From a paper:
Prokaryotic sodium channels, in contrast, are true tetrameric structures, composed of four identical subunits, each one equivalent to a single eukaryotic region. Prokaryotic orthologues exhibit approximately 25–30% sequence identity with human Navs and several have been shown to have sodium ion translocation activity and one (NavMs from Magnetococcus marinus) has been shown to be blocked by human sodium channel blockers with similar affinities and kinetics as the human Nav1.1 isoform3, thus indicating the structure/function similarities of eukaryotic and prokaryotic Nav orthologues.
The VS is in the fully ‘activated' state, with the outward gating charge position exposed to the extracellular surface, and indeed, the activated state seen here is what would be expected at the 0 mV condition present in the crystal. The pairing of NavMs R2 and R3 with the side chain of E46, D49, and N25 in helices S2 and S1, respectively, are also clear. R1 is located at the extracellular end of S4 and is not ordered in the crystal structure. The three SF sodium ions and waters visible in the SF of this open-channel structure are virtually indistinguishable from those previously identified in the structure of the open pore-only NavMs construct. The extension of the S6 helix (which is the proximal region of the CTD closest to the gate) forms an interaction motif involving specific salt bridges and hydrogen-bonded interactions with the S4–S5 linker adjacent to the intracellular surface and with Trp77 in S3. In the EEE motif (residues 229–231) near the end of the extended S6 helix, E229 forms a salt bridge with R119 in the S4–S5 linker, whilst E230 and E231 form hydrogen bonds with N238 and H237, respectively, in the top of the ‘random coil' region, leading to the C-terminal coiled-coil. R118 and Q122 in the S4–S5 linker interact (by aliphatic stacking and a hydrogen bond, respectively) with Trp77 in S3, a residue that is fully conserved among prokaryotic and human sodium channels (all isoforms and all domains) but which is not conserved in other ion channels such as potassium and TPC channels.
Author numbering:
A (entry chain A), B (entry chain A), C (entry chain A), D (entry chain A): -1 to 91, 100 to 262
Amino acid sequence: SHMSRKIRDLIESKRFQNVITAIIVLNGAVLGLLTDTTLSASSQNLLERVDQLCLTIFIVEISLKIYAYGVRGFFRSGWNLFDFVIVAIALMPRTFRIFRVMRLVSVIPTMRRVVQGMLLALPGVGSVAALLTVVFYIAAVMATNLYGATFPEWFGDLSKSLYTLFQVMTLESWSMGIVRPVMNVHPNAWVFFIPFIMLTTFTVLNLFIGIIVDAMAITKEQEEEAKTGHHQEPISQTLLHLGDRLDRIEKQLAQN
Amino acid sequence: SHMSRKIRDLIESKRFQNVITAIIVLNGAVLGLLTDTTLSASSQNLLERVDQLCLTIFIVEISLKIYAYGVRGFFRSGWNLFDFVIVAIALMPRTFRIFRVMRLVSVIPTMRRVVQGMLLALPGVGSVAALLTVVFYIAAVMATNLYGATFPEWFGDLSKSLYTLFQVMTLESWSMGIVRPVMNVHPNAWVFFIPFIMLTTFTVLNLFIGIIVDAMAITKEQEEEAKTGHHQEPISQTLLHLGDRLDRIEKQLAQN
Amino acid sequence: SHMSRKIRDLIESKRFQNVITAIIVLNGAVLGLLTDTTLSASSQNLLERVDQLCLTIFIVEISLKIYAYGVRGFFRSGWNLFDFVIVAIALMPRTFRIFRVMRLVSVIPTMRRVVQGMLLALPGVGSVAALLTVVFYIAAVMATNLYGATFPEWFGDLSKSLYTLFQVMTLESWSMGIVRPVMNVHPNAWVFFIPFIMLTTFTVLNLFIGIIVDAMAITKEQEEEAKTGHHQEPISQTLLHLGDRLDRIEKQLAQN
Amino acid sequence: SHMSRKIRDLIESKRFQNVITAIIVLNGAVLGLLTDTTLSASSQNLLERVDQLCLTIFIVEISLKIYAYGVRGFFRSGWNLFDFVIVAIALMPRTFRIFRVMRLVSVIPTMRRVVQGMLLALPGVGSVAALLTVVFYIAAVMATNLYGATFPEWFGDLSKSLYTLFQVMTLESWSMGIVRPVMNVHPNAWVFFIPFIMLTTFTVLNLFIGIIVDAMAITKEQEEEAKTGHHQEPISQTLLHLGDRLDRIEKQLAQN
Ligand code: NA
Ligand code: NA
Ligand code: NA
């Protein structure tokens, strides 16, 4: 309808986006002020009302989107569902209201494209992430059996071992705090910890670089399609089209 | 034979892979439960029997593979030999039973391709890895002679020096824990430690990046061959084929 | 005019650049000597006069540039404005005189091209930098509310939380110094800190790699234009020109 | 001459290289044994004679090379000069005899090519390395003036400041050990240290990545020339040759 189209044109405008962005910033700003324990009862009540006002605007915003697009229809987009879930959860009296500042990502298209490039890059690194999970699980079992009776605060159970192996992987006090004390009791403990550090720091870097390279390439195409209407074809496809042109030229030549 | 082909078709199926994967997970799960020191005698005996059941399945699995393929023949693949070695070692009554969770890598083709890309990338970085080994050995000898008499816990012998130089390379308490105390006795010790850190962190990063770049390219070809039957030709070869087509066109033209 | 052209040719020469570079180095050298608290009154007065001499040369240098180019005109370049701002601020009797050693960057063209490649690369990473800012802000609010009453030195207010979350992101004593003590009171604190470390170290690396890749490509073009007069065309444009040549050949052929 | 050619063919052989490599390893092995303080007088005297034997072989090796190639002539190669300098310095009775294990690099061609790729990559990163030097110098002067009177062990002079800023850049105890104690006296010290960490870790990574990318590409060409006799032409040159072929085809066509 004409009314549905007039609302969709209003929602899709730059001015509507700037209003919603400003209210997300305002809501984020009042929640950060609400962390201040020294505030008076009146100052806290005022900020709580400003938070209530920001939330009511988001309910009106989402409701306008459900009418202008539909109920099949708005919910067909993961970014709208995320925006709905975040505002609908606040209407049910969890505790972490500051998570609605994540809406900046969904409302700003350039930020939205960066995050969807990272999410689309995750399937392609799943095998590397599973290999890291396997290495961590094997190492956690070994460390519990080897050092749990002598160092129970760090290796007393599987949970404790997973925690201190994550610490060891991040190279945080790994030697002065963990392995030099462990070696005072188990002199050959370096045989376990030095290869564990070599393997996990390498795997983590591999996983991170895999995400960065894919996400950069994916975002580069999404940004191109959002501006021009399409993306740049790969060099291999351009060389195939050039090769097909050479085949068409050779076919037209030598005969007819 | 018809029986050998029916077994090979069963082994190569997706359902057989999912059964073996589930039993590896189950075995890994019971071994992690066996780390719990608070367990009763009955609970431990039950898990030990479940571990025995998982192992007997793997013996039947490997035996089925030796019949369906051969004895020259199954052992012609490094992934089958690895699977054989890991299950045959358990039948000899070492201590680290959790290493059979590494079978997930050999059983899942996507994980198998990630690991073989990393292993195939190792020869190409051997010279960088040897340079790191040389720098570490030279530095360990120097540090033993320079600081061993005054700091014997850290540099008393070659083994102690290799250990604390690995710690220094990982930047773990390098200054507050090692070099500021060493400098209280040897004021110019920074002349040794700051270039050592500059050289080794650089070489380690070079080695790691070398593996990541090669492994990514190698896996990209192995994944392509496993799905399509072949891999994408390099841009230089495509440009050579295009160049050869231009030579064939020029030869057919100007004369005949 | 002939005088204006003779000054511009003097300014643009290699010898004038080497004189200005030497005076920047000299000024930097005397300021580093002025950090020495053990210096006599005469030694300090001498260095203060040498600093005064270096500054008067820069005033003459800038004044020569304003005459040889203009007042619209010299100030049309960001590198000249930076050079003007840095010398004009010294004539107003802030405290950090050593910031004029940054002039080496503006005076040496190779260093100037490296820095402008980094600055030109910043817009393209703005969305990633904003995502990091959002994650840090959300995390700072959460950490203040969760741990501020029990750990006020680290999380007592928003400012304190932003500081210790930056420390946590850099992996500095994150576990032995912050999270193991926090977990003694809040056993599930790892649920907050381990994903925060995973997200921020990843985002920081993404931001840094984004700057490095773009800056390298941008500098590579600026260095080419400064030497040859132009830069290398992209492979996609070269393939488009080759494709356009094949279209012109096919059009000239088959007819006329 | 026939004798000079027979020696050059002996020097250039694989067997001569394997003998020299074995003696370098042997020399390195005895020097590592000489770090052992518990050794008897006879055991030490024996190893000292083995070290003397290894050195005499190197003198004969270098002397054979000076005859087979010349005196203009052997010294025309940086790798021969390095080999000469390292063996000639031992004949003058400095202290660090283990530096002759660096000869492995010069004797093994694959290791030699890795190191020359790194050295050839250094000029191209000189501007980034100078920018890091400038930032470190400015920061060292600022930190001496700001914190030297209150924290003289860390910032008492320029040398002390350069040392603890290098520590801060490596993120080693930067907060718990340096900046939290400094902030107890100077509450706004984070304004200096957090941007310093942001700038230097970024610049170091930029410098390291710049070396890794260039060194990889340079070694890839040197390895190709050492095996095939030449290196692979860039994609831009191949596209220029293809473009030149299209120009020659178009010129031969439409007329004659
Ligand atoms: Na650290
Ligand atoms: Na670190
Ligand atoms: Na640390």
